[PDB]
Design a protein around this ligand. Structure first.
Ligand code: 5S9
Length: 113
């Protein structure tokens, strides 16, 4: 029960803040299926920040859970696919921690609407 425009503005800002935490840009675009040919054997639903931006602008995220679910997919897919001793796995841990904090403050802003 709120106005759509300010909510989408908030999600845009939040997505930018999450992208800033991914300093290696490992989650900016889909995992290249040509470069990782076995990726879909293990990962049911790929996700990345560019796809999230497209979903946001297609009005596919109408509540904070919609948005956070796709962020969580970025993280969980990376933890699932990559071995624990890799930069990629640790980058997902870091994003979960740092991006979680961004998400908690942003959800609080949405609740004020
Ligand atoms: C499996 N994975 N999770 C996050 C990033 C990747 C990944 O394999 N990225 C990657 C690896 C080699 C490349 F040439 C390009 C990539 F985007």
């Amino acid at each position: 029960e709120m106005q759509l425009t300010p909510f989408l503005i908030l999600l845009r800002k939040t997505l930018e803040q999450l992208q800033e935490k991914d300093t290696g840009n490992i989650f900016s675009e889909p995992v290249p299926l040509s470069e990782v040919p076995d990726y879909l054997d293990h990962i049911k639903k790929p996700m990345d920040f560019f796809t999230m931006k497209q979903n946001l602008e297609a009005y596919r995220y109408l509540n904070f859970d919609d948005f956070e679910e796709d962020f969580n997919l970025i993280v969980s897919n990376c933890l699932k696919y990559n071995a624990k001793d890799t930069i990629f796995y640790r980058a997902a841990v870091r994003l979960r921690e740092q991006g979680g904090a961004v998400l908690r403050q942003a959800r609080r802003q949405a609740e004020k609407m």
